[PDB]
Write a protein that binds this ligand. Sequence first.
Ligand SMILES: [Cl-]
Length: 96
Amino acid sequence: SDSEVIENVPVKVYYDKTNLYISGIPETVTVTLSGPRSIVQSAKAQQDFTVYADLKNASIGTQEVKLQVKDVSDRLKVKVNPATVNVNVQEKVTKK
Ligand SMILES: [Cl-]
């Protein structure tokens, strides 16, 4: 078993980009990977996993969101720091 702490991993953010703009998510996070050596090392070398905040079902306003990981081997244990973040989901247009 092997383990790597990877710094400065980008966070993708998914949402209705047509109507909304979302501020507050960090641009990067720290990801910890553990599992079989070959798989941990390939993930570190290629960094082909994806950390994301999915705000597709969010309503306008302030909230919190847990960060997810995809495109990652099923043989790895993964955690993200910070695990959850504050977000501000704003409408691109103003009604005031
Ligand atoms: Cl904000």
